[PDB]
């Protein structure tokens, strides 16, 4: 996260990092047992890790439980990013508590000019590195449709949505992958793609998760 702010430990609940012997992307905890994430996300030998706030010191109130199955959309397109989502159900179902708990999926899609909340591990530089241990948060509006597709001139379809600032500063980044934006409590978008990170007139993009809410509750009901 680019521009954003230290969120406060355990303030953002359904976030998690996953972890293959080193942070590598963000997901949303939806129900005791399953994580949305991004399909560019997928790799083997995945554990989730929830009740994370510094990712590099145990502080007591984190779960650890390893994937027992990973789901990528059926149509993911990996050259687009076309359908960026992925399921990622847990071995066993973690114990919810205030500092470990599900997000709500969408029923309706979240509306151009709605303020959202976009957090992350990763990293907080436009230009060069800097990776912080502790989770950082961004308040960021949903942009117009044809501001989006301005930016990213034939890229952008049906299924993603821009939302940060075309002035450029504010942004998710690499290792933000895959993690949450939450508007009015519910999971609207999943952090997806862009064209580096905070600069003019290349916001990020989205998955935009309402399309997806009856593949996710179909795939859940039967895995
Ligand atoms: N820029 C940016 C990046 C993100 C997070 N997602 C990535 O870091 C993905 C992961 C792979 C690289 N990537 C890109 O977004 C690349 N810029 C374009 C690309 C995509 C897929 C394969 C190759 C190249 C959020 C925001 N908001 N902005
Ligand atoms: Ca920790």
Avoid at 62 to 68: D, G, L, R, T
Wanted: overall charge positive; aromatic content about 8%; charged content about 10%.
């Amino acid at each position: 996260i680019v521009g954003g702010y230290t969120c406060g430990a355990n303030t953002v609940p359904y976030q998690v990092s996953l972890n293959s012997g080193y942070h590598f992307c963000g997901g949303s905890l939806i129900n005791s047992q399953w994580v949305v994430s991004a399909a560019h996300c997928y790799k083997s030998g995945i554990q989730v890790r929830l009740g994370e706030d510094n990712i590099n010191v145990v502080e007591g109130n984190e779960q650890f439980i390893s994937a027992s199955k990973s789901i990528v959309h059926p149509s993911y397109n990996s050259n687009t990013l076309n359908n960026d989502i992925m399921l990622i159900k847990l071995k066993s179902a973690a114990s919810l508590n205030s500092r470990v708990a599900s997000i709500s999926l969408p029923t309706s899609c979240a509306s151009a000019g709605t303020q959202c909340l976009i957090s992350g591990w990763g990293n907080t530089k436009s230009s060069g590195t800097s990776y912080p241990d502790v989770l950082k948060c961004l308040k960021a509006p949903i942009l117009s449709d044809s501001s989006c597709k301005s930016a990213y001139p034939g890229q952008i379809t049906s299924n993603m949505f821009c939302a940060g600032y075309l002035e450029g500063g504010k942004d998710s980044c690499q290792g933000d992958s895959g993690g949450p934006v939450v508007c009015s409590g519910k999971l609207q978008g999943i952090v997806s793609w862009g064209s580096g990170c905070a600069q003019k007139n290349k916001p990020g993009v989205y998955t935009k998760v309402c399309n997806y809410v009856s593949w996710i509750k179909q795939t859940i009901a039967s895995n």
